[PDB]
């Protein structure tokens, strides 16, 4: 059976755990690792997921090396978390020693009325990186399946 090792990275508090809990366990209430079989485009896929901010080492650096795809998560009401994205992407590229690593940019907390990061800013950044941008809410489930499944599709594209 096909397995995908996914890593969800981003500043603390952006909702990495909340997004992964919503995907895997289907709930939100206002575990660092998760493992579940799902079906994506008719392919049975075992998802092995790690949520990490990088400040919590061994399992982490290992996780970055084996990770096949990465969600780069910021929150739309956290400018610093958006500013941090470049650091996370550069870190992954260095560890993977590759310019072609499957990634998706995720702007979480889209349900909130407080916004300090413009959708255009995020779209522009993702365009520069050549990766998808998806607006999500772990609370309402907006974009959650789309974010993770898009990443799995990026991994497939890489492997093809």
Ligand X SMILES: Nc1nc2c(ncn2[C@@H]2O[C@H](COP(=O)(O)OP(=O)(O)O)[C@@H](O)[C@H]2O)c(=O)[nH]1
Ligand Y SMILES: *CCS(=O)(=O)NC1CCN(C(=O)CNc2cc(Cl)c(Cl)cc2CC)CC1
Least distance (Å) between residue 15 CB and ligand X? 3
Encoded tokens for 126: 């993702």
Q: Which of 3, 13, 16, 12 is nearest to 104 (CA)?
A: 16
| 73 in contact with ligand Y (CB under 6 A) | no
Q: Mask 30-59, x = binds ligand Y (CB under 6 A)? A: -----------------------x-x----
Give helix then strand counts, H and E, for the chain.
6, 6
95 binds ligand Y (CB under 6 A): no
Nearer to ligand Y, 45 or 108 (CB): 108
Residue number, nearest CB to Mg ion: 17
Q: Which member of 6, 7, 9, 18 binds ligand X (CB under 6 A)?
A: 18
| Distance separating alpha carbons of residues 31 and 53, to the nearest angstrom | 14
Q: What are phi and psi of 79, to 5 degrees?
A: -60, -45
| 103-108/133-135 β-pairing | parallel
Q: Is 76 a binder of ligand X (CB under 6 A)?
A: no
Q: Is 17 in the site for ligand Y (CB under 6 A)?
A: no
């Amino acid at each position: 059976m096909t397995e995908y090792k996914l890593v969800v990275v981003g500043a603390c508090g952006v909702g990495k755990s909340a997004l992964t809990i919503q995907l895997i366990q289907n709930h939100f209430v206002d575990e660092d690792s998760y493992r579940k079989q799902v079906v994506i485009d008719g392919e049975t896929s075992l998802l092995d997921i790690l949520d990490t901010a990088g400040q919590e080492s061994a399992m982490r650096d290992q996780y970055m090396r084996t990770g096949e795809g990465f969600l780069l998560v910021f929150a739309i009401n956290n400018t610093k978390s958006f500013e941090d994205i470049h650091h996370y992407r550069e870190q992954i590229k260095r560890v993977k020693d590759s310019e072609d690593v499957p990634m998706v940019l995720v702007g979480n907390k889209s349900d909130l009325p407080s916004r300090t990061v413009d959708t255009k800013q995020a779209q522009d950044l993702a365009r520069s990186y050549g990766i998808p941008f998806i607006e999500t809410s772990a609370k309402t489930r907006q974009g959650v399946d789309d974010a993770f499944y898009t990443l799995v599709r990026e991994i497939r594209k890489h492997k093809e």
